[PDB]
Design a protein around this ligand. Sequence first.
Ligand SMILES: CC(C)[C@H](Nc1ncnc2[nH]c(C(=O)NC3CN(C)C3)cc12)c1ccc2c(c1)S(=O)(=O)CCC2
Length: 168
Amino acid sequence: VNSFSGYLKLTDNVYIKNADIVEEAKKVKPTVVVNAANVYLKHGGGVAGALNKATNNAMQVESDDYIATNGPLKVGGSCVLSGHNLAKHCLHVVGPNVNKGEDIQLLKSAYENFNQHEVLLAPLLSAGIFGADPIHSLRVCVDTVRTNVYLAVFDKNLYDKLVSSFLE
Ligand SMILES: CC(C)[C@H](Nc1ncnc2[nH]c(C(=O)NC3CN(C)C3)cc12)c1ccc2c(c1)S(=O)(=O)CCC2
């Protein structure tokens, strides 16, 4: 149904909210929820772990079956799989992990995958333990994505810092 509410409008197509992506998926019922995935689709912690746990492990079982036949994804790449009880589809997107030496330039490619979907619920790519500068990831999102993206950032201090820096 894509019933997003309580979001700050950053541009004509980019919205942001201090919220848990899992709780947003449950209320909004989006056509697409984006997962901050790794190349082998192992959803053990962070955003991936929260989405997988909200599907009672159905996402991980489906992901293991995909990996068995198709092998790993590439950094900057993506894969559409079922969204289970959280969405119609889950778009698993691999952003670069700069804390593991991955190229930050690939973050533009990661966001480009959002342009295949009219409207998406998404986390801020490569933030958290992936180590990218969150203000830079927001700028790559604004500059790259043309479709409607609703960003859920589950940290009030980070949300306030991003909004303040964007309004400069
Ligand atoms: C920046 C940070 C605040 C953000 N985290 C989140 N952003 C939006 N929704 C979220 N729900 C939960 C959660 O733990 N949800 C569970 C509580 N439980 C009730 C459900 C966390 C989270 C974030 C964004 C991107 C990435 C990461 C973290 S990561 O996982 O460290 C590496 C991958 C890239």
